[PDB]
Design a protein around this ligand. Structure first.
Ligand SMILES: CC1=C(N)C(=O)c2c(COC(N)=O)c3n(c2C1=O)C[C@H](N)[C@@H]3O
Ligand SMILES: CC1=C(N)C(=O)c2c(COC(N)=O)c3n(c2C1=O)C[C@H](N)[C@@H]3O
Lengths: 128, 128
C-alpha cells in the first residue's frame, strides 16, 4: 500500500478554502460548493477536505474533537523572515496565532497558527 | 510557501511505529528511541511523529483531543480485495476496526481503522 492522501474534516468549506488559499495552496475552482475538495502536492500526494455532512453520510459517528491537535500541517518558507511576516499577515486577517515565531531547538524558525476549524498549521524555515 | 510535512503527536513512539511499519511505511532504524521520527513519501513530503514529551517542550498547552478525528491518513491498495484482507489483518493484530470495508458512493472500496492513538487510517482501492 502507498500513502496517497491526507484528509481534513471541515465545518465550512469556503472558510477553510479562504485560509488554505492564503497559505499558497492551489485550490480547485468552485471548491466552495464541493462536498469534497482536493489539492495536489509535489509527488502527487493529495490534501483533501470533506464537509462534516459528507463525513456523516458514511461515518455518522463522527464528532469534532476538543482540545489539542493530533495532527499538524507544516509549510516551509524560503527564509526565516518570511515566517515572521506570514505569521503577522495571518493574525491580521483574523486567524488564531497559537505560538509566535521562535528559534526552535531543532534548528528552524518556527511559528504555529490555527486554521478556522482549530487545526494546527506550522510555519517554518531553516535557521542560517 | 510549500507544504513539506505532516506531523502526528504520539503517546508512544514504538507502539505507533509498529502500526505504521505494518502499513508499509519505511520507518527509520531505531525510531523507537527518537523524540521525533520522519518517513519519506513520494515527492519528498514527510510524514513525522513527535512524542507528547517533545511537543510539550515548546507547546506545553498541548493536550490530547477527545472524540472525532479532524484528520485521516489514506493508504491506497492495488486492488479492492487487498482492502478487505488488510482490514482483517489489522483487526487480528488488535487494532481498532472502525468501519468495515464497503463500496463507497465515490467509487472506491473503503475501510477505516484506528492507529494506537485513535487516529483515523483509511484503506482504499478504486472499484472496477
Ligand atoms: C465526493 C467525494 C469524492 N469525489 C472523493 O473522491 C472522496 C474520497 C477519496 O478518498 C480517497 N482516499 O481517494 C473520499 N471521500 C470522497 C468524497 O466524498 C470522503 C472520504 N473522507 C474519502 O476520503
Ligand atoms: C527532534 C526534532 C527534529 N529533529 C525535527 O526536525 C523537528 C521538526 C521538523 O519540523 C519541520 N517542519 O521540518 C519538528 N519538530 C522536530 C523535533 O522535535 C517538532 C515539531 N512538531 C516540528 O514539527
Amino acid at each position: 500500500a502507498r500513502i496517497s492522501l491526507f484528509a481534513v474534516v471541515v465545518e465550512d468549506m469556503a472558510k477553510s478554502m479562504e485560509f488554505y488559499r492564503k497559505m499558497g495552496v492551489e485550490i480547485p475552482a468552485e471548491a466552495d460548493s464541493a462536498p469534497h475538495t482536493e489539492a495536489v502536492l509535489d509527488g502527487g500526494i493529495r490534501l483533501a477536505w470533506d464537509t462534516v455532512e459528507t463525513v456523516r453520510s458514511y461515518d455518522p459517528e463522527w464528532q469534532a474533537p476538543t482540545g489539542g491537535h493530533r495532527f499538524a500541517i507544516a509549510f516551509e518558507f524560503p527564509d526565516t523572515a518570511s515566517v515572521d511576516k506570514k505569521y503577522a499577515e495571518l493574525v491580521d486577517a483574523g486567524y488564531e496565532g497559537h505560538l509566535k515565531p521562535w528559534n526552535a531547538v531543532w534548528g528552524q524558525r518556527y511559528a504555529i497558527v490555527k486554521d478556522p476549524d482549530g487545526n494546527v498549521v506550522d510555519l517554518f524555515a531553516p535557521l542560517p
